[PDB]
Amino acid sequence: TFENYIGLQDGFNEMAYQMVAHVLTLGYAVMLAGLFYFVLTIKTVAPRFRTSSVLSVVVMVSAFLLLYVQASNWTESFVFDTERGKYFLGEGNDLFNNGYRYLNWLIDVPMLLFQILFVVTLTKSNFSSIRNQFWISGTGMIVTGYIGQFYEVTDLTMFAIWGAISTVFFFHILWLMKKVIDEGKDGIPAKAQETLQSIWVLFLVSWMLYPGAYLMPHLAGIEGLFFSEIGVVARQITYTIADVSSKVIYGILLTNVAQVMS
């Protein structure tokens, strides 16, 4: 409950509050933009690759609704105070919770992991085990990382152990994902492999922003510059930077591969 500590203790200034709102807003705006693209490029690809576009489409709705709800929740959860000149947390149900983002990833991560297996062929690996290990590891990554965030402020020590258990589940993801890229690369045109490598480095970078934002409150030391409203701002841009990269750009690039393969 990092945002609710800052939101109630220090408060949010007008710039910070309206930035998180605006960033989240264009976040769900580009989600619907990416959805428009994936529907249009469904007959651009062969029937074999149309499962990937649907997975992109399904991912687009869920990210939009998440970014949509979190944008609405952010607008309503913090009420302006006239005497102090800041926005403070207030009472209701349906308050802004960054853990809702986690539960979204619980289902979005496997889809984003699966849909490349529908684009990319597996050589010297069976589709079942790869997909099956993707599922358990990514799910195991998110659930324990979900747990650690509960101790983001009250217990930094549990925040450490739980958040570290998941980052090896992360390292599992990258260790199963690399061969998917590798084995699927050779055999198809080299330009599609170059795309696929860009898809890998993009994969690498964007998926580090999610533990990187998980480390925003305690980056400039435990309670430094980022244990403030700017650390709350910084976290929500980062997520929005990651979400476009991890989903829209990632799916757009998986389609180019599917288009190149006809």
Added chain:
Amino acid sequence: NATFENYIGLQDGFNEMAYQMVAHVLTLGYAVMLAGLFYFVLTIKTVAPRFRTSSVLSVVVMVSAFLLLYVQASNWTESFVFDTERGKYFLGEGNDLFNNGYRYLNWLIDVPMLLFQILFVVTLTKSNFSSIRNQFWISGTGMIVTGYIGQFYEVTDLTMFAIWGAISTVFFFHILWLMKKVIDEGKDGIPAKAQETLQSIWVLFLVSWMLYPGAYLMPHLAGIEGLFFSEIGVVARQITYTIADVSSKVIYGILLTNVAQVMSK
């Protein structure tokens, strides 16, 4: 292995009346979506800011429903070729009507939005907003996904048709149970006029959403399939789907603004 509309269009064919009635009801469909879009943009100012998230969601539902119902109308016109020997329309050139993908893509997109938006209007006393949303999404998505999968076996494998269709009804009965809770809970504490509208919303939700399995699963469940395995059944199902979409999207969103307008006073 074959869609109901594909089999009829490839084997039996379509006489002029049936062929033009499907396009007619499809064009009427997106016309109602475009007209509903006018209402929602025009009413966005009639509610307090906290309820414009629901109105804009309706706008989003209208745009995508309009666009996707539009492509279906265009595809229906372009996918069939007239045969002068039979006086009928036959799907040609390996046109599969996209396996009704645009129809199911439309449902895949709109269903979560339709379920999500009522939480932006209605206030909850006992339930966890995030968990309701997650369940809504899981059930709604699985329903349409399993509906699209089983739709390929309606003419071929009755066993596979039943196993996927029965799975879609699991998700469906779960949605009904959820939507009933949200509405019954959101009635507490609000003016009785919005309570009455919320009940009309429930009844409308119940009936309209029921029309989709009615046109797909209930013909086989009652043994009336076979009488509809023709061009008549293709038209009857499309008309039912279109009436259901107007009710579940446009009429649904209108009543939501009426609740938000009462609570915005």
